[PDB]
């Protein structure tokens, strides 16, 4: 089975600047390597066919190069619309495979998230469940980690998070993390905290509340 690996996994590009992303094949595939662009929840589209051939209707700024195991996709003078996921795919041998993708986003100034913690509502507590929400608003870059602490004890496996796509207006991301406990488990503890680590913060920020 031919495995394709893409590098980098994530890249941030300033508009009008040049960007080169790569695709590595486990075994030689000659020129049987194709590139696709995919925007969130949208249909993918072919950019470059057979490693270096431009496809009809693709802007002139997109180009491809490579043979054997090493392939590159270059975007000369990046446009705002070029922020997307880019995939490579090999048609050299069955079963056909895709690379894991490279997410290209718009580069902007670093912005630390504004962090807020929400205790569960009294209405939800009545039903027997407590959902504690940690909101990370309008941050850049996309990389951010949330650490739930209950009476200073680090939590694991009882939280789920969701991140928005890059905002078309200010180029930031927002993240929501929900800590889910039963009413009985929630009442056994006093202090609920969410610790946020991001490039925009020198020290990880903690937002907390007292249950009682």
């Amino acid at each position: 089975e031919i495995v394709l690996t893409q590098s980098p996994d994530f890249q941030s590009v300033t508009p009008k600047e040049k960007v080169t992303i790569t695709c590595r094949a486990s075994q030689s595939i000659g020129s049987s390597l194709h590139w696709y662009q995919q925007k969130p929840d949208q249909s993918p589209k072919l950019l470059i066919k057979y490693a270096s051939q431009s496809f009809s209707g693709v802007p002139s700024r997109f180009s491809g190069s490579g043979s054997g195991t090493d392939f590159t996709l270059t975007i000369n003078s990046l446009e705002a619309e070029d922020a997307a996921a880019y995939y490579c795919h090999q048609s050299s041998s069955l079963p056909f495979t895709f690379g894991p993708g490279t997410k290209v986003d718009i580069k902007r100034t670093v912005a630390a998230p504004s962090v807020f913690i929400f205790p569960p509502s009294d209405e939800q507590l009545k039903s027997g469940t407590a959902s504690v929400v940690c909101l990370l608003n309008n941050f850049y870059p996309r990389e951010a980690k949330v650490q739930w602490k209950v009476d200073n004890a680090l939590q694991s496996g009882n939280s789920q998070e969701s991140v928005t796509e890059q905002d078309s207006k200010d180029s930031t991301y927002s993240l929501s993390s929900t800590l889910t406990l039963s009413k009985a488990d929630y009442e056994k503890h006093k202090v609920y905290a969410c610790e946020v680590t991001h490039q925009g913060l020198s020290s990880p920020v903690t937002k907390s509340f007292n249950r009682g």
Binding site: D41, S91, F118, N137, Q160
Partner: protein, 218 residues
Amino acid sequence: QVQLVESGGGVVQPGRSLRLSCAASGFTFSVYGMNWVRQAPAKGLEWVAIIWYDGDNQYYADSVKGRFTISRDNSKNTLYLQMNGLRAEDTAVYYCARDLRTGPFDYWGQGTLVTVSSASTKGPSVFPLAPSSKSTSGGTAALGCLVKDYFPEPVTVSWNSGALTSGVHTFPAVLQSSGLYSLSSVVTVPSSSLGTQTYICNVNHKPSNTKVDKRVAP
């Protein structure tokens, strides 16, 4: 113009069967090999299967071989995917893609969503995310609604009947261990507006015919 339109996607229980179709137009269908490519939530593109021009030959990815059957009907300009023994992992957007001389996938459809779950149709419970001085920073206060325990996707969330759009963030839904979805929708407003301005999230869930308006009080 070359067009591919997938259909047949929906909610299916684990172990059951589902047949997808892909309607092709704007080209001679029998000239091209055809493929199925899928994308599971938060995952990359995954090649599923290929069928050659006359349907005489088929090849499958290891993940579907022995469970899925690719077929075609050239007079109907249609590509099929017969899916059997469906598992939770098979939940994905299924794309129909035209094959150019067994090389690149030159044209793709819009995709059809397949949801493999043993969960039943359920309306959401809507809970407020109450604003205060604790949700206040730099003259702005954050508030929201937690749209919990619904199935299947999607839900639509608007604020003050769509009049409030600035400062709104509606997060992608999360699939809980229960098999039910959950999402939060937040809004950031001037902190001085709390107590003077009314904030209501309008939650609509079409599959269960549920409409819930929740007053978010400070």
